[PDB]
Design a protein around this ligand. Structure first.
Ligand SMILES: COc1cccc(C(=O)Nc2ccc(C(=N)N)cc2)c1O
Length: 223
């Protein structure tokens, strides 16, 4: 995340860190004790999910680790266009909830009224480095018309745009799959956007979570 700052220790209990081959890969969102939501482009072998983390560099009493038993990529995911960039991960070990480990409810209304939005993650910062401490930034949803002009013929109804006109606060590589939180509800997932990261003109592109309500429920309630 570029142009943000360190999060308050107790404000991100839904945040997951996704690892592959012992290295941070993506962010994720805890949505149920057994399920983490992330982007489909975060699919890698033998993912390890870390919950209740703040600083990646140290062992924290609040942390919980789990391997993934099932990875469910949306059937209509299209890698080239990032369309329908969403995946559900079933945890081997259900999340032991605490003040620092809690699920985030989903936004179900695609026409939800404007609320304060924020993004968070351990992705690439302004200096080009990966932070040990989780970063946060307040951002705003961008009108679909403005986003379509920014990315001609690339924005589908399964995507939502967000950014910041003042400093260009934006999500980046490593934040992928992490949450776009609006009014204490999951509104989007970090998917793609401007490279180098910065949202002053080309806003960040997020998977539009409200479109996936039925698919998420059907996957979680399957078998
Ligand atoms: C495993 O996932 C990845 C691997 C390599 C690169 C990326 C990446 O560049 N993502 C990305 C780019 C721009 C934005 C933005 N809003 N400006 C957000 C995310 C990646 O996600």
């Amino acid at each position: 995340l570029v142009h943000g700052g360190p999060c308050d220790k107790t404000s991100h209990p839904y945040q997951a860190a996704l690892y592959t081959s012992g290295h941070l890969l993506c962010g994720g969102v805890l949505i149920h004790p057994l399920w983490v939501l992330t982007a489909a482009h975060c699919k890698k072998p033998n993912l390890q999910v870390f919950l209740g983390k703040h600083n990646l560099g140290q062992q924290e009493s609040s942390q919980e680790q789990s391997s993934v038993v099932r990875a469910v990529i949306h059937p209509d995911y299209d890698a080239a266009s990032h369309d329908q960039d969403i995946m559900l991960l079933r945890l081997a070990r259900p999340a032991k909830l605490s003040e620092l480990i809690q699920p985030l409810p989903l936004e179900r209304d695609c026409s939800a009224q404007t609320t304060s939005c924020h993004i968070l993650g351990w992705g690439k910062t302004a200096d080009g480095d990966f932070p040990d401490t989780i970063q946060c930034a307040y951002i705003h949803l961008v009108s679909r018309e403005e986003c379509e002009h920014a990315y001609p013929g690339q924005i589908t109804q399964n995507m939502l745009c967000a950014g910041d006109e003042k400093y260009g606060k934006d999500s980046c590589q490593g934040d992928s799959g992490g949450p776009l939180v609006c009014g204490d509800h999951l509104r989007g997932l970090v998917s793609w956007g401007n490279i180098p990261c910065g949202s002053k003109e080309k806003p960040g592109v997020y998977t539009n979570v409200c479109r996936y309500t039925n698919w998420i429920q059907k996957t979680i309630q399957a078998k």
